[PDB]
């Protein structure tokens, strides 16, 4: 077609193995890379390669730019620009990262020295401790622009009689555990290579997911990564009833 | 029947029963019971003043009481309801519209030997069903596809063009030549070869030199008309032509079935007798067009997400305009959640079922503002793939076609904030006067595109193809039990032998359209939000529609 300013290339990535899809046929998998803005533009028109006849599947449409950068670069990102001195140009506009990127060693992330705050609900690197993160974030729009470490302990309960002492006790430990929270967060982050604020403490499957995904990307295997969905992303064949899967 | 007399003197029925007996039991009617006789004493005593020697009054009262029993079927014995019919009599001196779910729809079998529909008693009414009464019996699994084949073959054999005729497959076991017209299920044998199956038997099919009739879809699990030659050296029917059974309009279909009240709003039918009615249809067609264009019911764009904030804001802006002119009916359709809700083993966060409950509590806040829309509008709730009970098993996939309504436990006070709200199954039938509309929500175009026969050899054409296949096959599920399981005893809900007058067929994978075919109208709402635009369409029972957009 040549109409799109993208990069396509025939690839041999190892596909997943859905029980229904078993016929070998041939191999003509492709590796189309294309910026998301013109992808949204191409969503509009009827005729385009991504939506035409004889399309078997799209296999990694679920992964967001956030996940791509947190998996590729990591916490310790550095600039290998050289060429023309566009550091000022890079900082005034948005630094495009595809052309120039490198991931430096993160053996020591930070020698911590910074102020910490609180914000709690019982229905600057601030720590958000609320049952409803989304509601508090939406109600105060100014809360979005500040960096927050979101640690959520939820479902407060009351005996309905003499609740003042139990409120005091529930407040005391949350007041006094700040030194432990930050210490454990840094301890996990220094090995994890995920940035501190994106990472959560109780979240443990996320570490496994990122590590397994990046060590898979070291190989040619396809991720089948799927976001906030209980089923794997197999290209759309996963949306049909099958006896073996059942 | 009149008032203002002196006072209601009390008299014993012994001095009243002879007149009632002579008027009712002797001439027309019978069985004036003792309790019923005592009941008929009060109203005749209401105007008792200067009577039992008067002229017409008592005779006319008995005549009027007989009028109800000729009008209503009732029975023989007269019971304490005798006052209940006089309440109707004094009553004599919109409505008739209903929404029928999948479960409450009447069941009808078909006898091929008799060319007629036989009633099936509902197990809920007579069976105890205290512990397990919804569960089918194994015999339905054996007749599920036989019923489809009988209905389609009757229609094929009553077509005008056919009078070569369709031959049973086993009649081909000794022939070495000639031509045959075979009708049956297209599927794959357990060996992996394409085959055709009819109640008589089965045969393998060769597609190597087949020329299909373009204009529709050839998916496994549907009836197909085929033509070719049978070779006895092996067992193969070499195909030379392929088509689909022709469709039939509902006006010519009704006459064959008489005037059966399938979606009976005129009355109900039992194992004894059936119901038919013709004269009322003319007058109610008159009433449909009797300057009732004010009626206005609206189907929203499918797949609207409550958890998203922008969708909620757009819905508030839309209801802002809907408040001005309240729709007659408002159908909220599509999945109400953007993520399937399952057991959610992790309890650190709030449970997904509690989140489902909470997302149905913001609707009350957003709806309580607009009082008129509450006061004079009826809302119809359609489920979706990611609702509560189904997603607990399918995990967001599409499974059984008869999908039960949303549980009343997690949605309780939306019935209070709004006046008329009805929860309905995934396939439902709106009976509006002399009109039947079918509500169905699934992605049909994707499944058609994925599963095609692929014969070895502008986008709106696909919409016409989909409409023609769905309408000619006379069934909403042209698929085998493998692709989509079906509740065995509820399959009649999905069979369109009489073509509906108006069809609601929403598919997010297919662009919106407005097509007409043999006696029906097919509309496609879909994709509530698209290209930063929120769309919703209006339709009027006078066969005009409108599209209204609100960024």
Short mmCIF file of N, CA and C in Angstrom, two decimals, chain A residues 121-242:
data_model
loop_
_atom_site.label_atom_id
_atom_site.label_comp_id
_atom_site.label_asym_id
_atom_site.label_seq_id
_atom_site.Cartn_x
_atom_site.Cartn_y
_atom_site.Cartn_z
N UNK A 121 -8.54 8.52 54.25
CA UNK A 121 -10.00 8.57 54.31
C UNK A 121 -10.50 7.33 55.05
N UNK A 122 -11.49 7.52 55.93
CA UNK A 122 -12.07 6.44 56.72
C UNK A 122 -13.59 6.50 56.65
N UNK A 123 -14.18 6.18 55.49
CA UNK A 123 -15.64 6.20 55.33
C UNK A 123 -16.35 5.16 56.20
N UNK A 124 6.19 17.27 45.58
CA UNK A 124 6.18 16.56 46.85
C UNK A 124 5.56 15.17 46.72
N UNK A 125 6.24 14.17 47.28
CA UNK A 125 5.85 12.77 47.15
C UNK A 125 4.84 12.44 48.24
N UNK A 126 3.59 12.84 48.01
CA UNK A 126 2.51 12.50 48.93
C UNK A 126 2.17 11.03 48.81
N UNK A 127 1.72 10.44 49.92
CA UNK A 127 1.26 9.05 49.94
C UNK A 127 -0.25 9.04 50.08
N UNK A 128 -0.92 8.38 49.14
CA UNK A 128 -2.38 8.34 49.09
C UNK A 128 -2.87 7.03 49.70
N UNK A 129 -3.63 7.14 50.79
CA UNK A 129 -4.20 6.00 51.50
C UNK A 129 -5.71 6.22 51.57
N UNK A 130 -6.42 5.80 50.53
CA UNK A 130 -7.86 6.02 50.48
C UNK A 130 -8.57 4.80 49.92
N UNK A 131 -9.79 4.51 50.38
CA UNK A 131 -10.55 3.39 49.79
C UNK A 131 -10.85 3.58 48.32
N UNK A 132 -11.09 4.81 47.88
CA UNK A 132 -11.45 5.11 46.50
C UNK A 132 -10.41 6.07 45.91
N UNK A 133 -9.42 5.50 45.22
CA UNK A 133 -8.39 6.32 44.59
C UNK A 133 -8.99 7.17 43.47
N UNK A 134 -9.81 6.54 42.62
CA UNK A 134 -10.34 7.24 41.45
C UNK A 134 -11.25 8.39 41.85
N UNK A 135 -12.11 8.17 42.85
CA UNK A 135 -13.04 9.22 43.27
C UNK A 135 -12.30 10.43 43.82
N UNK A 136 -11.32 10.21 44.70
CA UNK A 136 -10.55 11.32 45.25
C UNK A 136 -9.74 12.02 44.17
N UNK A 137 -9.17 11.26 43.23
CA UNK A 137 -8.41 11.87 42.15
C UNK A 137 -9.30 12.73 41.26
N UNK A 138 -10.51 12.25 40.96
CA UNK A 138 -11.40 13.00 40.10
C UNK A 138 -11.99 14.23 40.77
N UNK A 139 -12.35 14.11 42.05
CA UNK A 139 -12.99 15.22 42.75
C UNK A 139 -12.07 16.43 42.83
N UNK A 140 -10.80 16.21 43.16
CA UNK A 140 -9.81 17.28 43.23
C UNK A 140 -8.91 17.12 42.00
N UNK A 141 -9.17 17.94 40.98
CA UNK A 141 -8.39 17.87 39.75
C UNK A 141 -6.94 18.26 39.99
N UNK A 142 -6.70 19.15 40.96
CA UNK A 142 -5.33 19.56 41.26
C UNK A 142 -4.51 18.41 41.82
N UNK A 143 -5.17 17.37 42.33
CA UNK A 143 -4.45 16.22 42.88
C UNK A 143 -3.71 15.45 41.79
N UNK A 144 -4.16 15.56 40.54
CA UNK A 144 -3.54 14.79 39.46
C UNK A 144 -2.12 15.27 39.19
N UNK A 145 -1.90 16.58 39.21
CA UNK A 145 -0.61 17.15 38.83
C UNK A 145 0.50 16.88 39.83
N UNK A 146 0.19 16.35 41.00
CA UNK A 146 1.25 16.09 41.96
C UNK A 146 1.60 14.61 42.01
N UNK A 147 2.86 14.27 42.31
CA UNK A 147 3.25 12.85 42.38
C UNK A 147 2.74 12.21 43.66
N UNK A 148 2.12 11.04 43.53
CA UNK A 148 1.53 10.34 44.66
C UNK A 148 1.93 8.87 44.60
N UNK A 149 2.25 8.31 45.76
CA UNK A 149 2.47 6.88 45.93
C UNK A 149 1.19 6.31 46.51
N UNK A 150 0.51 5.46 45.75
CA UNK A 150 -0.85 5.04 46.07
C UNK A 150 -0.80 3.70 46.79
N UNK A 151 -0.97 3.73 48.11
CA UNK A 151 -1.07 2.52 48.92
C UNK A 151 -2.46 2.48 49.53
N UNK A 152 -3.21 1.42 49.26
CA UNK A 152 -4.63 1.37 49.58
C UNK A 152 -4.92 0.24 50.56
N UNK A 153 -5.30 0.61 51.78
CA UNK A 153 -5.94 -0.30 52.72
C UNK A 153 -7.42 0.06 52.78
N UNK A 154 -8.28 -0.93 52.60
CA UNK A 154 -9.68 -0.68 52.26
C UNK A 154 -10.60 -1.35 53.28
N UNK A 155 -11.90 -1.09 53.11
CA UNK A 155 -12.96 -1.75 53.88
C UNK A 155 -12.81 -1.52 55.39
N UNK A 156 -12.94 -0.26 55.80
CA UNK A 156 -12.99 0.05 57.22
C UNK A 156 -14.32 -0.42 57.80
N UNK A 157 -14.28 -0.99 59.00
CA UNK A 157 -15.46 -1.52 59.66
C UNK A 157 -15.51 -1.00 61.09
N UNK A 158 -16.72 -0.98 61.65
CA UNK A 158 -16.95 -0.43 62.97
C UNK A 158 -17.80 -1.38 63.80
N UNK A 159 -17.57 -1.43 65.12
CA UNK A 159 -18.45 -2.24 65.98
C UNK A 159 -19.79 -1.58 66.27
N UNK A 160 -19.97 -0.32 65.88
CA UNK A 160 -21.17 0.50 66.02
C UNK A 160 -21.35 1.01 67.45
N UNK A 161 -20.54 0.57 68.41
CA UNK A 161 -20.60 1.07 69.78
C UNK A 161 -19.20 1.46 70.24
N UNK A 162 -19.09 2.66 70.81
CA UNK A 162 -17.82 3.18 71.33
C UNK A 162 -16.71 3.10 70.29
N UNK A 163 -16.94 3.77 69.16
CA UNK A 163 -16.02 3.64 68.03
C UNK A 163 -14.86 4.62 68.09
N UNK A 164 -14.90 5.58 69.01
CA UNK A 164 -13.79 6.53 69.13
C UNK A 164 -12.47 5.86 69.47
N UNK A 165 -12.38 4.97 70.47
CA UNK A 165 -11.09 4.29 70.71
C UNK A 165 -10.58 3.50 69.52
N UNK A 166 -11.47 2.82 68.79
CA UNK A 166 -10.99 2.00 67.68
C UNK A 166 -10.57 2.87 66.50
N UNK A 167 -11.23 4.02 66.30
CA UNK A 167 -10.72 4.98 65.32
C UNK A 167 -9.34 5.49 65.71
N UNK A 168 -9.14 5.79 67.00
CA UNK A 168 -7.83 6.26 67.44
C UNK A 168 -6.76 5.20 67.20
N UNK A 169 -7.06 3.94 67.54
CA UNK A 169 -6.09 2.87 67.33
C UNK A 169 -5.81 2.65 65.85
N UNK A 170 -6.84 2.72 65.00
CA UNK A 170 -6.64 2.54 63.57
C UNK A 170 -5.82 3.69 62.98
N UNK A 171 -5.93 4.88 63.57
CA UNK A 171 -5.14 6.01 63.09
C UNK A 171 -3.69 5.93 63.55
N UNK A 172 -3.45 5.39 64.75
CA UNK A 172 -2.11 5.43 65.34
C UNK A 172 -1.11 4.64 64.49
N UNK A 173 -1.47 3.42 64.09
CA UNK A 173 -0.53 2.58 63.36
C UNK A 173 -0.22 3.15 61.99
N UNK A 174 -1.24 3.70 61.32
CA UNK A 174 -1.01 4.35 60.03
C UNK A 174 -0.14 5.59 60.18
N UNK A 175 -0.25 6.29 61.31
CA UNK A 175 0.65 7.41 61.57
C UNK A 175 2.08 6.92 61.73
N UNK A 176 2.28 5.83 62.48
CA UNK A 176 3.61 5.42 62.90
C UNK A 176 4.31 4.48 61.92
N UNK A 177 3.63 4.00 60.88
CA UNK A 177 4.25 3.02 59.98
C UNK A 177 4.95 3.64 58.77
N UNK A 178 5.10 4.97 58.74
CA UNK A 178 5.67 5.64 57.57
C UNK A 178 7.09 5.17 57.29
N UNK A 179 7.91 5.07 58.33
CA UNK A 179 9.28 4.63 58.13
C UNK A 179 9.37 3.24 57.52
N UNK A 180 8.45 2.36 57.91
CA UNK A 180 8.44 1.01 57.35
C UNK A 180 7.97 1.01 55.90
N UNK A 181 6.95 1.81 55.59
CA UNK A 181 6.38 1.77 54.24
C UNK A 181 7.43 2.13 53.19
N UNK A 182 8.10 3.27 53.38
CA UNK A 182 9.07 3.78 52.41
C UNK A 182 10.25 2.84 52.32
N UNK A 183 10.70 2.31 53.46
CA UNK A 183 11.83 1.40 53.46
C UNK A 183 11.53 0.15 52.65
N UNK A 184 10.36 -0.46 52.87
CA UNK A 184 10.02 -1.66 52.11
C UNK A 184 9.82 -1.35 50.64
N UNK A 185 9.23 -0.19 50.33
CA UNK A 185 9.04 0.21 48.94
C UNK A 185 10.38 0.34 48.22
N UNK A 186 11.35 1.00 48.86
CA UNK A 186 12.67 1.13 48.26
C UNK A 186 13.35 -0.23 48.14
N UNK A 187 13.18 -1.09 49.14
CA UNK A 187 13.79 -2.42 49.09
C UNK A 187 13.28 -3.21 47.89
N UNK A 188 11.97 -3.14 47.63
CA UNK A 188 11.45 -3.83 46.45
C UNK A 188 11.88 -3.14 45.16
N UNK A 189 11.89 -1.81 45.14
CA UNK A 189 12.16 -1.09 43.90
C UNK A 189 13.60 -1.28 43.44
N UNK A 190 14.55 -1.35 44.39
CA UNK A 190 15.96 -1.44 44.00
C UNK A 190 16.24 -2.72 43.23
N UNK A 191 15.48 -3.79 43.49
CA UNK A 191 15.63 -5.02 42.73
C UNK A 191 14.67 -5.06 41.54
N UNK A 192 13.51 -4.42 41.66
CA UNK A 192 12.43 -4.55 40.69
C UNK A 192 12.70 -3.82 39.38
N UNK A 193 13.33 -2.64 39.45
CA UNK A 193 13.64 -1.78 38.31
C UNK A 193 12.37 -1.07 37.82
N UNK A 194 11.23 -1.40 38.40
CA UNK A 194 10.03 -0.58 38.21
C UNK A 194 10.12 0.69 39.04
N UNK A 195 9.70 1.84 38.52
CA UNK A 195 9.74 3.08 39.32
C UNK A 195 8.90 2.97 40.58
N UNK A 196 9.31 3.73 41.60
CA UNK A 196 8.77 3.61 42.95
C UNK A 196 7.28 3.94 43.00
N UNK A 197 6.86 5.00 42.31
CA UNK A 197 5.47 5.44 42.42
C UNK A 197 4.52 4.54 41.64
N UNK A 198 4.95 4.00 40.50
CA UNK A 198 4.12 3.05 39.77
C UNK A 198 3.91 1.78 40.58
N UNK A 199 4.96 1.30 41.24
CA UNK A 199 4.88 0.09 42.02
C UNK A 199 4.06 0.30 43.29
N UNK A 200 3.33 -0.75 43.67
CA UNK A 200 2.57 -0.80 44.91
C UNK A 200 3.12 -1.93 45.77
N UNK A 201 2.81 -1.89 47.07
CA UNK A 201 3.39 -2.85 48.00
C UNK A 201 2.66 -4.19 47.96
N UNK A 202 1.34 -4.18 48.16
CA UNK A 202 0.58 -5.42 48.17
C UNK A 202 0.62 -6.10 46.80
N UNK A 203 0.72 -5.32 45.73
CA UNK A 203 0.82 -5.87 44.39
C UNK A 203 2.10 -6.69 44.24
N UNK A 204 1.96 -7.99 44.01
CA UNK A 204 3.11 -8.87 43.88
C UNK A 204 3.11 -9.55 42.52
N UNK A 205 1.92 -9.72 41.94
CA UNK A 205 1.84 -10.34 40.62
C UNK A 205 2.38 -9.42 39.54
N UNK A 206 2.38 -8.11 39.79
CA UNK A 206 2.86 -7.15 38.80
C UNK A 206 4.35 -7.33 38.56
N UNK A 207 5.12 -7.58 39.63
CA UNK A 207 6.55 -7.82 39.49
C UNK A 207 6.80 -9.04 38.62
N UNK A 208 6.08 -10.13 38.89
CA UNK A 208 6.22 -11.35 38.11
C UNK A 208 5.87 -11.07 36.65
N UNK A 209 4.80 -10.32 36.43
CA UNK A 209 4.36 -10.03 35.07
C UNK A 209 5.43 -9.26 34.30
N UNK A 210 5.97 -8.20 34.89
CA UNK A 210 6.97 -7.39 34.18
C UNK A 210 8.23 -8.21 33.92
N UNK A 211 8.73 -8.92 34.93
CA UNK A 211 9.95 -9.69 34.74
C UNK A 211 9.77 -10.76 33.67
N UNK A 212 8.66 -11.50 33.73
CA UNK A 212 8.42 -12.58 32.79
C UNK A 212 8.23 -12.03 31.38
N UNK A 213 7.52 -10.90 31.26
CA UNK A 213 7.32 -10.29 29.95
C UNK A 213 8.62 -9.80 29.34
N UNK A 214 9.50 -9.17 30.13
CA UNK A 214 10.73 -8.66 29.53
C UNK A 214 11.71 -9.78 29.21
N UNK A 215 11.76 -10.83 30.05
CA UNK A 215 12.63 -11.95 29.71
C UNK A 215 12.05 -12.78 28.57
N UNK A 216 10.75 -12.66 28.32
CA UNK A 216 10.19 -13.24 27.10
C UNK A 216 10.55 -12.39 25.89
N UNK A 217 10.51 -11.06 26.04
CA UNK A 217 10.88 -10.17 24.94
C UNK A 217 12.35 -10.30 24.59
N UNK A 218 13.18 -10.73 25.55
CA UNK A 218 14.55 -11.11 25.21
C UNK A 218 14.55 -12.19 24.13
N UNK A 219 13.58 -13.09 24.18
CA UNK A 219 13.34 -14.06 23.12
C UNK A 219 12.34 -13.48 22.12
N UNK A 220 12.04 -14.24 21.07
CA UNK A 220 11.15 -13.77 20.02
C UNK A 220 9.68 -14.11 20.27
N UNK A 221 9.35 -14.66 21.44
CA UNK A 221 7.99 -15.10 21.74
C UNK A 221 7.06 -13.89 21.89
N UNK A 222 5.82 -14.04 21.44
CA UNK A 222 4.82 -12.98 21.53
C UNK A 222 4.25 -12.96 22.95
N UNK A 223 3.96 -11.76 23.44
CA UNK A 223 3.60 -11.54 24.83
C UNK A 223 2.25 -12.13 25.22
N UNK A 224 1.26 -12.06 24.33
CA UNK A 224 -0.16 -12.32 24.63
C UNK A 224 -0.66 -11.49 25.80
N UNK A 225 0.02 -10.38 26.09
CA UNK A 225 -0.30 -9.51 27.21
C UNK A 225 -1.69 -8.91 27.04
N UNK A 226 -2.47 -8.92 28.12
CA UNK A 226 -3.83 -8.38 28.11
C UNK A 226 -4.05 -7.60 29.39
N UNK A 227 -4.69 -6.43 29.27
CA UNK A 227 -4.79 -5.49 30.37
C UNK A 227 -6.23 -5.41 30.87
N UNK A 228 -6.39 -5.47 32.20
CA UNK A 228 -7.68 -5.53 32.90
C UNK A 228 -8.69 -6.42 32.17
N UNK A 229 -8.26 -7.63 31.81
CA UNK A 229 -9.14 -8.60 31.18
C UNK A 229 -8.79 -9.99 31.70
N UNK A 230 -9.77 -10.76 32.18
CA UNK A 230 -9.45 -12.08 32.75
C UNK A 230 -8.97 -13.10 31.74
N UNK A 231 -9.14 -12.86 30.44
CA UNK A 231 -8.75 -13.84 29.45
C UNK A 231 -7.54 -13.36 28.66
N UNK A 232 -6.71 -14.28 28.15
CA UNK A 232 -5.55 -13.87 27.35
C UNK A 232 -5.96 -13.23 26.04
N UNK A 233 -5.07 -12.42 25.47
CA UNK A 233 -5.31 -11.79 24.17
C UNK A 233 -4.67 -12.68 23.10
N UNK A 234 -5.49 -13.50 22.45
CA UNK A 234 -5.02 -14.43 21.43
C UNK A 234 -5.34 -13.96 20.02
N UNK A 235 -5.73 -12.70 19.84
CA UNK A 235 -6.09 -12.18 18.54
C UNK A 235 -7.57 -12.15 18.24
N UNK A 236 -8.43 -12.41 19.22
CA UNK A 236 -9.86 -12.38 19.04
C UNK A 236 -10.52 -13.74 19.03
N UNK A 237 -9.76 -14.82 18.86
CA UNK A 237 -10.32 -16.17 18.93
C UNK A 237 -10.76 -16.53 20.34
N UNK A 238 -10.29 -15.80 21.34
CA UNK A 238 -10.62 -16.05 22.74
C UNK A 238 -12.01 -15.56 23.12
N UNK A 239 -12.75 -14.95 22.19
CA UNK A 239 -14.10 -14.46 22.45
C UNK A 239 -15.18 -15.43 21.98
N UNK A 240 -14.83 -16.70 21.77
CA UNK A 240 -15.77 -17.70 21.31
C UNK A 240 -15.74 -18.92 22.21
N UNK A 241 -16.90 -19.53 22.39
CA UNK A 241 -17.02 -20.74 23.20
C UNK A 241 -16.32 -21.91 22.52
N UNK A 242 -15.51 -22.63 23.30
CA UNK A 242 -14.84 -23.83 22.82
C UNK A 242 -14.95 -24.91 23.87
#
